[PDB]
């Protein structure tokens, strides 16, 4: 149950959320064959924000290195424990 | 109003997301302007995209291995082959091609689209008026008109990878600063507007229409003021130029109280305590960005530029110095008087304006 | 992949609105398809949604403090056992 709470905590989740909302507005506009510029510009800037957050996620690897050094920590602890 | 709104939305979408520089996006852009386009394989490594219209042919060489544009060539089907599509840089032996630069130096197609829209305008509206010839020669006629009128302005073609006739002044550091850009624009207001060829005659020292039979319809010669940008905006007396010649009036839309900073400076008591400011303007100040200088209005270029230069050197500096926290300072449309100490007018030389500002700064500091 | 397809379809929308309503409707349906698969792919994977900032610093601090206390106790053991 806490998983979804953690997922909602990171910004890019909200980013995909309002990106979906903006495309929903755009499709509603084109359904009414009345394309509103503000919806499209909101869509493009939200997409750009998505893409910058896509870069920001990548520099990931730090957590992975922390994970391997954590495994090193507990394996050293177990070794010294059996010692 | 639906078509005008749709065209305005299409222009907005074209400007807001110009697309990435790819062969497919360049082809789609050319097709969106009604240009005929074909792709040829010159080699296993090189493809050419050739695009054509009535007069213009543009070859774009694409390196398939590098994912990059290698070359761009413009060819005219006019009897005039001398159209300058290179940037005018003083002291570089390599004339840098505007079209190639717009596809290699920029992150997007916006620079290329603007330059292509300009070439397409000349193509569509050239017939017996050849606008490629006339626009090239016009830069020489304006340069001569300034020499004959003793105007200290430099004329360059094609500045910063953009088509246009650029009018430059010497700035305080001897650096050239653009004052205005002259170019052709579609006349949205009157498709029947006759645009004639005007030549500057060395003999008469005037603009002359040699061939009243040589006209194009639905085009205007536009003078755009290049703001270095609210304090860097140029303001004109409302009666300085006929309202029919004003293409773009910056309407301060009715929800932000930006008077000219000049008029707010007649209303706001936050002055240098040494100066009593007196307003002697008879007219309202309006912000004008674009002028129609077509036909008989080519004489106005020198008057508009003198005002723009006087406004930058005198008015804007007087305002900057008065606005930084008793002598009477009278400010009018064409003259400024500091009590009995110093005066300058719009018809004085630039050297008189500089001396007035130096003396004014020494008193206000 | 949905990102480049979204980009491209976005651009032929903004380049050619003068296409007949058939193309506009079909292309908008295509974008709705791509974002539908986008939201699905977001949905099944918890790890990405977690990916989708001081905690990393706190983990680094705890790792370095446990490392230094391990080094100190090992130095003490080395000093004591050599007798």
Curated annotation (Swiss-Prot), chain A:
It comes from the Eukaryota. It is found in: Nucleus. Belongs to the Mediator complex subunit 4 family. Present with 1617 molecules/cell in log phase SD medium. Component of the Mediator complex, a coactivator involved in the regulated transcription of nearly all RNA polymerase II-dependent genes. Mediator functions as a bridge to convey information from gene-specific regulatory proteins to the basal RNA polymerase II transcription machinery. The Mediator complex, having a compact conformation in its free form, is recruited to promoters by direct interactions with regulatory proteins and serves for the assembly of a functional preinitiation complex with RNA polymerase II and the general transcription factors. Component of the Mediator complex, which is composed of at least 21 subunits that form three structurally distinct submodules. The Mediator head module contains MED6, MED8, MED11, SRB4/MED17, SRB5/MED18, ROX3/MED19, SRB2/MED20 and SRB6/MED22, the middle module contains MED1, MED4, NUT1/MED5, MED7, CSE2/MED9, NUT2/MED10, SRB7/MED21 and SOH1/MED31, and the tail module contains MED2, PGD1/MED3, RGR1/MED14, GAL11/MED15 and SIN4/MED16. The head and the middle modules interact directly with RNA polymerase II, whereas the elongated tail module interacts with gene-specific regulatory proteins. This is Mediator of RNA polymerase II transcription subunit 4. It comes from Saccharomyces cerevisiae (strain ATCC 204508 / S288c) (Baker's yeast). The lineage of its organism: Eukaryota, Fungi, Dikarya, Ascomycota, Saccharomycotina. The gene is MED4. The chain holds residues 31 to 114 of 284 of the full protein.
Curated annotation (Swiss-Prot), chain B:
Its main location: nucleus. One of its GO terms (biological process) is negative regulation of transcription by RNA polymerase II. Keywords: Activator, Nucleus, Phosphoprotein, Transcription, Transcription regulation. Transmembrane segments: none annotated. Present with 4675 molecules/cell in log phase SD medium. GO terms for molecular function: transcription coregulator activity. Component of the Mediator complex, a coactivator involved in the regulated transcription of nearly all RNA polymerase II-dependent genes. Mediator functions as a bridge to convey information from gene-specific regulatory proteins to the basal RNA polymerase II transcription machinery. The Mediator complex, having a compact conformation in its free form, is recruited to promoters by direct interactions with regulatory proteins and serves for the assembly of a functional preinitiation complex with RNA polymerase II and the general transcription factors. It is found in: Nucleus. Component of the Mediator complex, which is composed of at least 21 subunits that form three structurally distinct submodules. The Mediator head module contains MED6, MED8, MED11, SRB4/MED17, SRB5/MED18, ROX3/MED19, SRB2/MED20 and SRB6/MED22, the middle module contains MED1, MED4, NUT1/MED5, MED7, CSE2/MED9, NUT2/MED10, SRB7/MED21 and SOH1/MED31, and the tail module contains MED2, PGD1/MED3, RGR1/MED14, GAL11/MED15 and SIN4/MED16. The head and the middle modules interact directly with RNA polymerase II, whereas the elongated tail module interacts with gene-specific regulatory proteins. It comes from the Eukaryota. One of its GO terms (cellular component) is mediator complex. This is Mediator of RNA polymerase II transcription subunit 1. Belongs to the Mediator complex subunit 1 family. The keyword Phosphoprotein applies.
Swiss-Prot record, chain C:
Component of the Mediator complex, which is composed of at least 21 subunits that form three structurally distinct submodules. The Mediator head module contains MED6, MED8, MED11, SRB4/MED17, SRB5/MED18, ROX3/MED19, SRB2/MED20 and SRB6/MED22, the middle module contains MED1, MED4, NUT1/MED5, MED7, CSE2/MED9, NUT2/MED10, SRB7/MED21 and SOH1/MED31, and the tail module contains MED2, PGD1/MED3, RGR1/MED14, GAL11/MED15 and SIN4/MED16. The head and the middle modules interact directly with RNA polymerase II, whereas the elongated tail module interacts with gene-specific regulatory proteins. GO terms for cellular component: core mediator complex; cytosol; mediator complex; nucleus. The keyword Transcription applies. Present with 1364 molecules/cell in log phase SD medium. Keywords: Activator, Nucleus, Transcription, Transcription regulation. It is found in: Nucleus. Signal peptide: none annotated. GO terms for molecular function: structural molecule activity; transcription coactivator activity. Component of the Mediator complex, a coactivator involved in the regulated transcription of nearly all RNA polymerase II-dependent genes. Mediator functions as a bridge to convey information from gene-specific regulatory proteins to the basal RNA polymerase II transcription machinery. The Mediator complex, having a compact conformation in its free form, is recruited to promoters by direct interactions with regulatory proteins and serves for the assembly of a functional preinitiation complex with RNA polymerase II and the general transcription factors. The keyword Metal-binding does not apply. It comes from the Eukaryota. Belongs to the Mediator complex subunit 9 family. A motif (Nuclear localization signal) lies at residues 14-36, 70-83. This is Mediator of RNA polymerase II transcription subunit 9.
